[PDB]
Amino acid sequence: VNQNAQALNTLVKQLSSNFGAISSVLNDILSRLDPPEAEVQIDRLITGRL
Amino acid sequence: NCVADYSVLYNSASFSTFKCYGVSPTKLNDLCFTNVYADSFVIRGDEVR
Amino acid sequence: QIAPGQTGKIADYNYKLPDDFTGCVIAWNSNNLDSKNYNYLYR
Amino acid sequence: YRVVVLSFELLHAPATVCGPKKSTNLVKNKCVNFNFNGLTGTGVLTESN
Numbered sequence: 001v002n003q004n005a006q007a008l009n010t011l012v013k014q015l016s017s018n019f020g021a022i023s024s025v026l027n028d029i030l031s032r033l034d035p036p037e038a039e040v041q042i043d044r045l046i047t048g049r050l
Numbered sequence: 051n052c053v054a055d056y057s058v059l060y061n062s063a064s065f066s067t068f069k070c071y072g073v074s075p076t077k078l079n080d081l082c083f084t085n086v087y088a089d090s091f092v093i094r095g096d097e098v099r
Numbered sequence: 100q101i102a103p104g105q106t107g108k109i110a111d112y113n114y115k116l117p118d119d120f121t122g123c124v125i126a127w128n129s130n131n132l133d134s135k136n137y138n139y140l141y142r
Numbered sequence: 143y144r145v146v147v148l149s150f151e152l153l154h155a156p157a158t159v160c161g162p163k164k165s166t167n168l169v170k171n172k173c174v175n176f177n178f179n180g181l182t183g184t185g186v187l188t189e190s191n
Binding site for chain 1: 072073074076077080081
Binding site: 051052053054055056057066072073078079080081082083084085086087088089090091092093094095097098 | 143144145146147148149150151152153154155156157158159160161162163179180
């Protein structure tokens with residue numbers, strides 16, 4: 001039960017990571033940038049979250 | 051302590067460059083800031099880069 | 100302003116490209132032929 | 143060349159320089175798209191304890 005908890009908690013703490021994007025939050029990127037540049041950053045998130 | 055209509059700035063043809071890096075310029079009307087600082091100085095035109 | 104995904108007076112109101120435009124933009128000075136001139140309208 | 147550099151504080155604090163947009167009335171206890179201060183999302187808004 002502790003290992004099944006550490007797995008889901010560490011999976012959710014990896015939503016706080018940037019992976020070298022300009023923000024850890026997808027809505028920040030989609031507020032601050034227009035699509036031609038936002039897609040360069042969201043591909044950092046989709047690469048790191050996947 | 052104010053409202054900044056960035057469309058008024060961006061629509062001006064007087065600017066030779068209007069280059070936004072950490073934001074896209076259309077988003078400046080959608081965003082909000084906790085400070086803004088304007089820097090202001092003169093250089094030669096070859097040094098703008 | 101003549102590139103994919105741009106913004107500006109032409110890129111809003113007169114001529115806009117897709118963000119993924121496939122093609123080529125070819126441009127040259129025509130002061131030697133077109134200047135006189137005010138028949139060149141734009142928004 | 144006259145250079146202006148508009149440096150932005152995107153850092154989290156109270157809203158102080160804003161974009162040219164009208165606010166609207168807050169709805170509680172129903173699903174809504176929202177923006178606060180450029181913090182965009184979707185949700186159900188409730189009184190916090």
